[PDB]
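Issue: ligand-bound run for 2-acetamido-2-deoxy-beta-D-glucopyranose - logging full I/O for the record.

Environment: standard queue, default settings, no custom constraints.

Inputs:
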Amino acid sequence: ERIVLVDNKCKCARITSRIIRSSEDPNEDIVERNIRIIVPLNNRENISDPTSPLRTRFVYHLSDLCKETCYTYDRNKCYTAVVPLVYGGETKMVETALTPDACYPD
Amino acid sequence: IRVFAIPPSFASIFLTKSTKLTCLVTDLTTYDSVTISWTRQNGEAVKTHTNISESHPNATFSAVGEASICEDDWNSGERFTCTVTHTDLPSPLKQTISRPLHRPDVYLLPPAREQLNLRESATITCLVTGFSPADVFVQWMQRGQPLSPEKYVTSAPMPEPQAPGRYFAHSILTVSEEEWNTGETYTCVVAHEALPNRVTERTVDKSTGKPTLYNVSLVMSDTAGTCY
Amino acid sequence: ESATITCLVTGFSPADVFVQWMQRGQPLSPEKYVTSAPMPEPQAPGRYFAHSILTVSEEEWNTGETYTCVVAHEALPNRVTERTVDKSTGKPTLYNVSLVMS
Ligand SMILES: *[C@@H]1O[C@H](CO)[C@@H](O[C@@H]2O[C@H](CO)[C@@H](O)[C@H](O)[C@H]2NC(C)=O)[C@H](O)[C@H]1NC(C)=O
Ligand SMILES: *[C@@H]1O[C@H](CO)[C@@H](O)[C@H](O)[C@H]1NC(C)=O
Ligand SMILES: *[C@@H]1O[C@H](CO)[C@@H](O)[C@H](O)[C@H]1NC(C)=O
Ligand SMILES: *[C@@H]1O[C@H](CO)[C@@H](O)[C@H](O)[C@H]1NC(C)=O
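Outputs:
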């Protein structure tokens, strides 16, 4: 019976405007919008940049996500950044894997 | 011998993607095999009326037609006339009609709570706060298929109080009370000239109505990277 | 920027109605509200309908304004009925917030 209005994965939100029938008598049925949000509490400010500050503030204006300052890594998407590496004095760029679990070659 | 001409209305072409053309010259006596013309001043061809009886039983009829013009002709804005001759007036009678913008404002409102409380019927209205020009058309949808004409009524435009240049209207559908009680969504597809797709569709349902309860869980977890 | 209020009138067989708006108990200017002609109801031709659209500033509607409506018509027991709406005219809309900290 749930109608999942929004499932934005950056600003994790699961607004479900599920209708609930009231008791045995209809015509007073209640409508409820369950904004289930999972604040990460640990993700960095610029989530793709690990060296950025920590998120001490989480704005969830529901108007924007109904229709970006990304917070939570999406399952399918891979967030990564280049890293410097030194082995014998050579500084070689290479891509990283900030979410290795979902970033296997597929 | 009333003489009048019906200009093509863009409201009509959005409904059927076709142009129906017939001039209107009423209150003329009986004429056998009536044949009337339609020639814009720069020389379009002549066409007679169709699907109109040449002599109605009442003897006070209107037998005069318009040539089938494409929508591009009215997009051009050229002039147009029906020239009518009959026994009553040998002198031909000619009348000239032509078309003389802002994004339409189309947001509807749901039924009141007390309407559903009465448990008799319900009223859903496709209010339009403002549009330009005046011409506009409203049609109601259900389950993606057109609704019957008898249910919905469309009101003519009125000038906006603070923006007399802007014009507003409304349409009403008297739907059953119990039908609205269940989750059946409707769309009041309107038709306006000043639109990108030339047609606007907006829908509502009980799920779109006023909510009461909000049990936002707003979970806070150290599990940060993965969503849910 | 603005607020639109529609006063639904439904079911006057005499087909004669005159709507007004009395905001804070005094009638408002006629030009503010515009009413529709009494065309027959779809469900029952004997019945008719009309609206009244009062455009007002959004902030004013957001600050405790009654925006009362009246209907002058014969069949009513006192010949007049009044209705009004504000922020809280609807149902209470209790919240159910939860805040898990696991
Ligand atoms: C900081 O956030 C910005 C976006 O707000 C991002 O910067 C760019 O992200 C794209 C995405 O692939 C990269 O290709 C660019 O190289 C980034 N910019 C620069 C200057 O490198 C990114 O999320 C964050 N920036 C960095 C450097 O990680
Ligand atoms: C919302 O209220 C209902 C009772 O109406 C209750 O069962 C439910 O647990 C509440 N939601 C919460 C606490 O998230
Ligand atoms: C919100 O309330 C409904 C009751 O209608 C309940 O079924 C649902 O589980 C609640 N939300 C959560 C996250 O438990
Ligand atoms: C909270 O939600 C509603 C509103 O007060 C109430 O009916 C319900 O029993 C409450 N439940 C919890 C777990 O707080």
